[PDB]
Design a protein around this ligand. Structure first.
Ligand SMILES: CCCCCC(=O)OC[C@H](COP(=O)(O)O)OC(=O)CCCCC
Ligand SMILES: CCCCCC(=O)OC[C@H](COP(=O)(O)O)OC(=O)CCCCC
Ligand SMILES: CCCCCC(=O)OC[C@H](COP(=O)(O)O)OC(=O)CCCCC
Ligand SMILES: CCCCCC(=O)OC[C@H](COP(=O)(O)O)OC(=O)CCCCC
Ligand SMILES: CCCCCC(=O)OC[C@H](COP(=O)(O)O)OC(=O)CCCCC
Ligand SMILES: CCCCCC(=O)OC[C@H](COP(=O)(O)O)OC(=O)CCCCC
Lengths: 47, 47, 47, 47, 48, 48
């Protein structure tokens, strides 16, 4: 399974995936996705 | 902030910290804690 | 474009699409999706 | 519960209701109202 | 002589419905308040 | 925070430049006035 950490750079409410993914790759993770409930951008990468 | 990944070795319900921390350090993380709701053992390490 | 209405039969909170789609098809709509903040099951069909 | 979808015939910006309702009734809905931010004309009808 | 008007100095966030804006504006000693339809500011009004 | 604003009751015609509007508004016991950008109304301003 992957490691996960909230994005430090993504601003505002996480609505769609691509912007979150882009922030997370800029933060040297491999993907990102919006949290379904709190709408935070969560980055993921192999641990 | 630290990365998080659920423990792959901790059995059953996460009640207190020490057993989860011990499992997570064996998995080469630096700490572990119980998730307050689902009672999963969550390993943490800098990433 | 499609008309949209909240599901009358979907119980609980909308987490993933397929359970919502299933309920919406039961109600004679063609698809369903989760609303992003309130997590409602919203059915869609041709108007 | 009413079905909703954007007017296909209402031109321009929805400021007040009557012109949107009128367009929506022409489109065989039963009412219309402006959306708050985008100022779309949204038609509604029993579904 | 229409009413005097200015933006609420206490209403937070986006003005969506009228009652919360009117409530803020009466606390500021105006007689009413309403959301501006385009910018969604809470605007207070009073005879003046 | 911002001043109260109200259309002038005495300013005739269309608001082109500020000084004639400011002068009419001070007569009306406001502290300033200015032209609205599109409709070219003379808008008077004063603390609420
Ligand atoms: C598919 C297009 C229309 C329906 C979309 C919808 O209902 O939102 C997706 C919902 C969840 O909502 P969001 O992830 O917040 O967009 O359910 C899923 O199946 C995604 C599952 C988890 C994805 C990781
Ligand atoms: C009934 C006679 C006409 C009154 C016109 C009016 O109410 O303004 C139009 C409103 C405009 O929206 P507001 O920002 O709420 O003023 O839209 C509606 O259709 C009502 C509900 C949705 C609000 C967008
Ligand atoms: C009527 C309650 C909805 C919340 C406040 C409101 O009156 O209208 C907001 C509208 C939604 O109005 P509804 O169609 O009823 O959902 O949407 C927007 O903000 C802009 C466009 C996107 C969605 C239409
Ligand atoms: C006639 C309906 C009841 C009261 C008036 C009203 O509709 O709301 C105040 C209006 C609405 O516009 P906003 O305040 O920007 O929302 O203010 C004006 O711009 C007109 C002032 C006059 C100069 C343009
Ligand atoms: C309302 C005028 C106030 C200030 C002067 C101005 O705005 O320039 C236009 C002036 C205004 O004159 P009046 O309309 O007579 O007031 O010249 C014209 O009338 C031609 C337009 C014909 C309009 C009927
Ligand atoms: C930013 C304020 C809103 C604009 C209204 C205003 O200031 O009224 C005066 C007008 C405004 O006209 P605009 O160019 O359209 O802004 O300016 C003048 O030319 C007067 C010269 C002397 C002083 C400007």
């Amino acid at each position: 399974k992957d490691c996960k950490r909230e994005s430090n750079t993504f601003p505002g409410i996480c609505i769609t995936k691509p912007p979150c993914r882009k922030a997370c790759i800029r933060e040297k993770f491999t993907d990102g996705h919006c949290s379904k409930i709190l709408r935070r951008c969560l980055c993921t990468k192999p641990c």
